[PDB]
Amino acid sequence: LENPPPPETSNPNKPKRQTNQLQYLLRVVLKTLWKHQFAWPFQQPVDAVKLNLPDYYKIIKTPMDMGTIKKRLENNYYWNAQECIQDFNTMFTNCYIYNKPGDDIVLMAEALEKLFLQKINELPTEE
Numbered sequence: 001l002e003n004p005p006p007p008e009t010s011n012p013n014k015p016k017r018q019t020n021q022l023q024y025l026l027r028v029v030l031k032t033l034w035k036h037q038f039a040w041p042f043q044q045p046v047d048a049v050k051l052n053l054p055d056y057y058k059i060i061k062t063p064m065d066m067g068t069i070k071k072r073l074e075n076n077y078y079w080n081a082q083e084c085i086q087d088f089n090t091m092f093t094n095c096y097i098y099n100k101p102g103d104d105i106v107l108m109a110e111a112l113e114k115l116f117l118q119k120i121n122e123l124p125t126e127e
């Protein structure tokens, strides 16, 4: 069994800018989730070889994880907040689609998502 390559995190030719909303997403949002005791399964791509999940990367179209989101924010991959918020939502929804309600990994995702929703409720207005 193989894992696919991770999501793209570096592209020197991409359109890029640095903005207050993206700074908040790294310094407040990602930082808050990252230090949480339930973060660790989300801090790197799902390793389907390690977990013996030969279907994961046949049924999940757009894998995402916080290690990738952290690198994307660090490399100014995201033009705007909506793109980064979408990556966090993809990460959560992948987890909820692949797993069953009340599974440990789902409880962990739900705790992280509650903190996420609270922090992006106060996403600053774009300057």
Ligand SMILES: CCS(=O)(=O)Nc1cc(-c2cc(NC)c(=O)n(C)c2)cc2c1ccn2C(C)(c1ccccn1)c1ccccn1
Residues within 6 Å of the ligand: 040, 041, 042, 043, 044, 045, 046, 047, 048, 050, 051, 053, 094, 095, 098, 099, 104, 105
């Ligand atoms: C750092 C990325 S890793 O891959 O190296 N490590 C892990 C990622 C995910 C995991 C699985 C998902 N679904 C299958 C998923 O959706 N996510 C987001 C993460 C789950 C992982 C691990 C390492 C161990 N587990 C288990 C044992 C687990 C849960 C469900 C299915 C298979 N194994 C686990 C159980 C309970 C609590 C936490 N962890």
